[PDB]
Design a protein that fits this description.
The complex is a heterotetramer, with two copies of chain A (101 residues) and two copies of chain B (121 residues). Chain A is mostly beta strands. Chain A has no helices and eight strands. In chain A, strand 2 and strand 3 form a beta hairpin. Chain A starts with a strand and ends in a 7-residue tail after the last strand. Chain B contains no helices and seven strands. Classes of the chains: A mainly beta (101), B mainly beta (121). Strand 1 of chain B pairs antiparallel with strand 9 of chain C.
């Protein structure tokens, strides 16, 4: 039946064509997703955005899609699954490349 | 690990990008070896470094998509492939063999690409 | 080599995605390291004096197997959906931001055409 | 048996992974190849060199391989095959890209 969203999976980012921060959220109805980057809401754009690649029933599998990230994007990322019955918050650290030096 | 399916577009060849602050020599667009100065003009100094991208380094042959081996998704029935570094030019403050200083177009690794060789029937 | 064209078996490594390189002298804007759009100046300070023209070496996918948007050469269509896409790299450039501050920033440019994959099902 | 060199095929460059100025040479013994760029002799390097991809009986198929050429390499290319019985010369023009400005 129904239930608050629950982040059942959030891992370090892996690099494919674009980089991906893999997540998995279970919850019904469909959870609203938001990310927090180092103590602030992350404003997505055409270089950083959320993509749900797999939606079974109440299980959603996706990525925080990143295009050409750099040390400039290292940091703690926080996915927020907000839904009609409540919310959940899980965090993950990300390293894409070290600072010049 | 998340299934390759739950993620997006995959690369035929894995790459690694990062800053290169210690490239002291390069090859220009004329094939000559040149010295790469440590500092570039002003906009105080400013250390000169680059943004390079190479093929994911890999000793135990076998796995697809690794630099030096086959590429991911290629039809082995008709092709023999290999992931290679792809270079391009970027302008850099340099010194030639005569020591003359000046901006020059030098090659650096900017991508990892897949190459083919037919074997079809 | 037949008479007008040589068979691929008589040539070297083929590209999975055909690309075209060239000098770019008319680039006035670009996106920097923070995603922000910036102005690209038409000249850089020479070795240590006079004004020198600023241009770039860019590589785009050849427009229409091997063409941009279309599937890549050598990819196994039985199991994949492939597309040739432009891969960008960061290069330094003399620029000016939204406000008016002039200076060296890392802008992103096209430097290669790579192949991307997606499993059929 | 005995054949003086003959360049039976030499054409404009094609763009593959690297650029290729295609050619075909016949002769026995195997001809020594040499290139001339804009009148002057072309000193080969790991960036511009002659490769024979296919050698049949007395036929040799190859390219002048070029790694990342530019307008600096635009020009007239002369192929010269030579063996104990004679020599042959054929020429072609190559445009790799426009000039800056």
């Amino acid at each position: 039946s129904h239930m608050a969203p629950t982040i059942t999976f959030l891992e370090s980012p892996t690099s494919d064509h674009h980089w991906c921060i893999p997540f998995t959220v279970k919850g019904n109805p469909k959870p609203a997703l938001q990310w927090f980057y180092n103590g602030a809401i992350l404003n997505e754009s055409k270089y950083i955005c959320t993509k749900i690649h797999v939606t079974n029933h109440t299980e959603y599998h996706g990525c925080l899609q990143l295009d050409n990230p750099t040390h400039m994007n290292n940091g703690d990322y926080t996915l927020i699954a907000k839904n009609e019955y409540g919310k959940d918050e899980k965090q993950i650290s990300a390293h894409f490349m070290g600072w010049p030096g | 690990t998340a299934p390759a399916s739950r993620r997006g577009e995959l690369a035929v060849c894995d790459a690694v990008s990062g800053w290169v602050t210690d490239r002291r020599t390069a090859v220009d667009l004329r094939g000559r070896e040149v010295e790469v100065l440590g500092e570039v003009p002003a906009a105080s100094p400013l250390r000169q470094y680059f943004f390079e991208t190479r093929c994911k380094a890999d000793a135990e042959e076998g796995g697809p998509g690794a630099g030096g081996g086959g590429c991911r998704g290629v039809d082995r029935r008709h092709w023999v492939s290999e992931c290679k570094a792809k270079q391009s030019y970027v302008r850099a403050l340099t010194a030639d063999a005569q020591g003359r200083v000046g901006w020059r177009w030098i090659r650096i690794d900017t991508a990892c690409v897949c190459t083919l060789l037919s074997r079809t029937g």
